[PDB]
Design a protein around this ligand. Sequence first.
Ligand SMILES: *[C@@H]1O[C@H](CO)[C@@H](O)[C@H](O)[C@H]1NC(C)=O
Ligand SMILES: *[C@@H]1O[C@H](CO)[C@@H](O)[C@H](O)[C@H]1NC(C)=O
Ligand SMILES: *[C@@H]1O[C@H](CO)[C@@H](O)[C@H](O)[C@H]1NC(C)=O
Ligand SMILES: [Zn+2]
Length: 600
Amino acid sequence: STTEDLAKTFLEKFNYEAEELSYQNSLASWNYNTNITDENIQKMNIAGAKWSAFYEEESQHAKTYPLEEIQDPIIKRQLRALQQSGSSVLSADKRERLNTILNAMSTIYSTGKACNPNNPQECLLLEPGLDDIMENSKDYNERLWAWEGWRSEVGKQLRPLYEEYVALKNEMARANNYEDYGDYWRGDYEEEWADGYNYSRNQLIEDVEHTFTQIKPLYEHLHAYVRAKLMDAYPSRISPTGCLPAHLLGDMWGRFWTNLYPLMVPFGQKPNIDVTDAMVNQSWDARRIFKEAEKFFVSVGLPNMTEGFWQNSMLTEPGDNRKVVCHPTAWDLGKHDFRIKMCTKVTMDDFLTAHHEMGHIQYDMAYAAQPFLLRNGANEGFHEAVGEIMSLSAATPNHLKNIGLLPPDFSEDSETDINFLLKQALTIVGTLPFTYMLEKWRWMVFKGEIPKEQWMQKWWEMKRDIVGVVEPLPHDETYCDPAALFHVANDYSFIRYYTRTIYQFQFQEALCQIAKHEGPLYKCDISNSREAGQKLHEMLSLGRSKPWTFALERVVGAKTMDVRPLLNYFEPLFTWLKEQNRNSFVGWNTDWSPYADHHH
Ligand SMILES: *[C@@H]1O[C@H](CO)[C@@H](O)[C@H](O)[C@H]1NC(C)=O
Ligand SMILES: *[C@@H]1O[C@H](CO)[C@@H](O)[C@H](O)[C@H]1NC(C)=O
Ligand SMILES: *[C@@H]1O[C@H](CO)[C@@H](O)[C@H](O)[C@H]1NC(C)=O
Ligand SMILES: [Zn+2]
């Protein structure tokens, strides 16, 4: 009769149908990831077709029920998520063309090669060959031709495809009643109605801009320390007051600075804590690693893994030449079928990864009772934030002593802690300006504030100003350097890596006060605190049933993202960096470049 009554029955039928078809799609995809065979690609592709064809029919039919006539919030949330459409709103020719461009850009990125200018037979793909150069080489000229060749040979192919990509995607978003494709992506953070828990799409822009201005002091001192250490690694190549050359940052793009750590170890005589040998000396195996990760979550008041987890997960590589995807992943297939697939080895890195991935499973187990459409993180950044904080506590010397991987008399060393915090900052802090500037450029491109004749001009002006990074060779508009990163060429939003990092330290600081942690935040271990786990479970069980502002408030008492917990975590490093940069310039001029030696 009423519109809300009709939609309530519609959503119930949808949930049970989606439960069955999505389960078969996840099961088929799982059977491929654990048994790579052409047949398993076919059965996986059939499962994706039925599930996608079902979702398109149900999404269109959801538009029959006007939201204005729906009053219940839970029915309203499910309906809105289902009414949201994508490429289907375009006419058939524009829809076909966009799919053709998406496939083209993806295959160019995964099959494009750059050839060695000195050895023209050596032409390398990115993922094996070019990454190896950009992640391990210490030679200025070898990193240069890999950085330049990847953008001149592959990036220039993507430039005309990306220009049509922006126009077609902008039309798709506007037909969905958004301003542009950037406003469309920022809808992922939109929360529509509540008791002040609302969140406009424009609010994400301000919160990102506001939190970033507070990051800049810490980043500049990290930038200043890295610069002084890179001048020694590359003599006469880097200006002491200028920007960092883009091809010397540890990867193809400067996304993370982790691989610069061996060039700038604060105290090279102190080795970092590595409990691999203690694991091997105590005869640990992959099963013990996940039993210990399971024990950790039990210590904080969370349940054990299900019987299905232990019987169906692939915790080791099979080794009968069953070709397998070894990327560590946590699977919620539905129907309370939780599995982890990772080729675990007896190391400390996989030990930390096991806690990280099981944290994903704990999240999945928590919101299992929610309706189908509401079984996800509060927003796109919550799941990885929950997983990361698990790795923070499990890696602490306090937690390693309690499980017997460190001696009971183990004494902590500040120089060792500084080595730990710097390596963390090269990964965590170094990526925040990169991520923020990349998404800002995309947002401005989608909006039209950067015309096509200025794409590359504004790319490197923003790279210089915001990131303190300078291109080693001048790039005109025949280039498309942003498209040379996976997430840009493969049509993935990128701001999630920014927000996830803010969220995870908000979670950590909140739970560490509940866990009664005294002292610096980076030493906190939430182990054995059932109050910390019970508070976190309050939010995990919400899934996506409540606004993400509400879910964030339940753990940390604040309704919006706050970078001060992040700065608090790195405050001991901030103090050490400021004293190390006393005789070094902090900041950068945007006038210098390696193709032009001028400071004004
Ligand atoms: C792997 O796939 C092949 C072909 O699809 C199949 O014959 C085999 O039984 C599978 N192995 C396992 C362990 O599922
Ligand atoms: C919620 O809506 C009010 C109404 O104008 C607005 O002032 C406020 O900024 C909104 N909150 C968020 C987080 O967007
Ligand atoms: C988890 O399993 C262990 C081992 O049997 C058991 O002692 C413990 O009580 C279990 N915890 C929960 C919450 O079920
Ligand atoms: Zn993760």
